Amino acid sequence: GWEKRTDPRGRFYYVDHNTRTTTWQRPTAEYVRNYEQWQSQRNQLQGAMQHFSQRFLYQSSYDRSFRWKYHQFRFLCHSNALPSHVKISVSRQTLFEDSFQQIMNMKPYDLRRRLYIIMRGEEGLDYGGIAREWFFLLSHEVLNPMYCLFEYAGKNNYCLQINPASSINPDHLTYFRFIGRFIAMALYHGKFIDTGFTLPFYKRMLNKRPTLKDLESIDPEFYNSIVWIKENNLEECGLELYFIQDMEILGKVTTHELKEGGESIRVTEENKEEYIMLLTDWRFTRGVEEQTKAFLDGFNEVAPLEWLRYFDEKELELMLCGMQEIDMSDWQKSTIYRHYTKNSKQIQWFWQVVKEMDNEKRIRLLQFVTGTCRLPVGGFAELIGSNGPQKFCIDKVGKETWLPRSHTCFNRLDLPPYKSYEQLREKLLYAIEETE
Ligand code: NA
Incomplete structure (x- = not known):
């Protein structure tokens, strides 16, 4: 089915009868596609939980090594820890709704208090076990195509990235701010996630510029075209590009200028290092500016981003x-x-x-x-x-x-x-x- 019910605040949403889901997104063959391939993985989780629990890191006690960088970061956390705790209540099937309401109605500093999570109904006081399951479960819960927060550039689950079209969810910025708070919590409390963010996503959190190599990890198709432009120097031959990139945004196309007067300026030799650079710059930044700023604002509240400045993309992913x-x-x-x-x-x-x-x-x-x-x-x-x-x-x-x-x-x-x-x-x- 399809339908088109309305919100208490008069906003129109859809009721997908094909899934059994309600979304702000028009439930295409691809949305139903995305949702089922997401579904499977949500059920391939309790068997996988033991795998993810094998994850480890060091024990708290040369120089400029991951391990020192880590133990120094652990210290920065323990020093800024606030007394008492924060208890979050969730249900196994309501894990996302719940965590969202409770962490978004909490001031950021309360979140540095020692965590404890309660699995509604179920017997067992917390200890590390329920936080481990929480962090992992919810790490995936956030990728439900239902919420409009993410998408994938390539085959099935390859190259997680922010959906430029996420603005179709009026709360896209509240949710990306929550994801930020959440991922930060995981680093403050030592727990691990399996969200799937890439090295270039981890570079932005670090304020590091992504490179021409880095597109190979998101759009291998697109990385080659650019490599073709750089290597095949050219005799100009069978090529006519201008400093522009269009972007299909919920149907309507819009031509963005890589630089000023860009639609006018033709790609040439010597000129093309500038363009390759700019194009590369456009690809990570396009469609995801406010989503990413809300993530980061969301992350900074909890664990100041400046605390990660001495990590490279790899050390940080490994920390998470x-x-x-x-x-x-x-x-x-x-x-x-x-x-x-x-x-x-x-x-x-x-x-x-x-x-x-x-x-x-x-x-x-x-x-x-x-x-x-x-x-x-x-x-x-x-x-x-x-x-x-x-x-x-x-x-x-x-x-x-x-x-x-x-x-x-x-x-x-x-x-x-x-x-x-x-x-x-x-x-x-x-x-x-x-x-x-
Ligand atoms: Na790979």
């Missing part, structure tokens, strides 16, 4: 999701060679450097190759990418002088044919460690 034990056997068993084999010296050397690495250095290698620290239920075989499930792959691509290159959307590592164990090691270590 937690660490898993990377089993080297599942990794190796679930790895494919391209222009290489198992016996290639660069492969035998690659596994030798991965054998050295402690778990965090390996997690760091996983984030690099796949765009996240989160290893899925079922491990290295159940590795997913922009084109559905894709296994970890290493390809012989390069010049020896090059640094290894990742393809997070396909989980592929372009590993050049280095001349030595020590060359390859340093290069891999370098690519992974970045500049910390």
Whole structure:
């Protein structure tokens, strides 16, 4: 069905009989699509809960290492902790409605008080167990297409991003402010979430500029076109672009100027580094400005964003999701060679450097190759990418002088044919460690 009932405040909404849901969004074949693929995952959760509970982080007690950065942050929390507690009541099936009403009617500082959550009806005082389940359950509850808060650029659940069209929910900004408060709470209280935010989403929270590499993790299709513009320098040839980007916003198209007079200004050589930069800048910022500001205002109230300034995108995602034990056997068993084999010296050397690495250095290698620290239920075989499930792959691509290159959307590592164990090691270590 369809329908079109009305609100106490006279706003029109829809009653999807095909789902059994009420939304502000016109319930398309795609909305019904999105909602069912969301549904499944909501029921694939109680079996998965044990997986997510295996997540860990360090025990509270050189320098400029994730671990010090973390224990320093833990301290900043404990120092700003307020006495007494805040008890939130929820029901297993009312988890989102409930948490929203109670945390939005609370002043931000009350939320730094020690948490406790109550599962209505059900016997058992809190302790860590119900907060763990709460944080995880609600981390997914927020992605219900019903609320209009999110969408996915690619295949099924690939590349979580904010729905530019979220403005169709008059409370889109209250909800994105709540998500901000909530994700902040998780970091203040040490608990973990599995929302699915990407490294470039974590960069904004950190006030770090996303790059041309970073679009490969959201729009691999779009990242190539831009790579085509940069690499195929061109003889101008079969190309005519202007400094513009249109955007379909709830049907009506609108042409945005990347710069002033942009519709007028043609893309050319030398000129195109400016444009590539701007386009890249447009892609993360377009349609999601107020949603993202409300997130962040929402986040800042609870745990000041300035407290994360010394983390890079990877350290922060890892602070929110937690660490898993990377089993080297599942990794190796679930790895494919391209222009290489198992016996290639660069492969035998690659596994030798991965054998050295402690778990965090390996997690760091996983984030690099796949765009996240989160290893899925079922491990290295159940590795997913922009084109559905894709296994970890290493390809012989390069010049020896090059640094290894990742393809997070396909989980592929372009590993050049280095001349030595020590060359390859340093290069891999370098690519992974970045500049910390
Ligand atoms: Na991936």
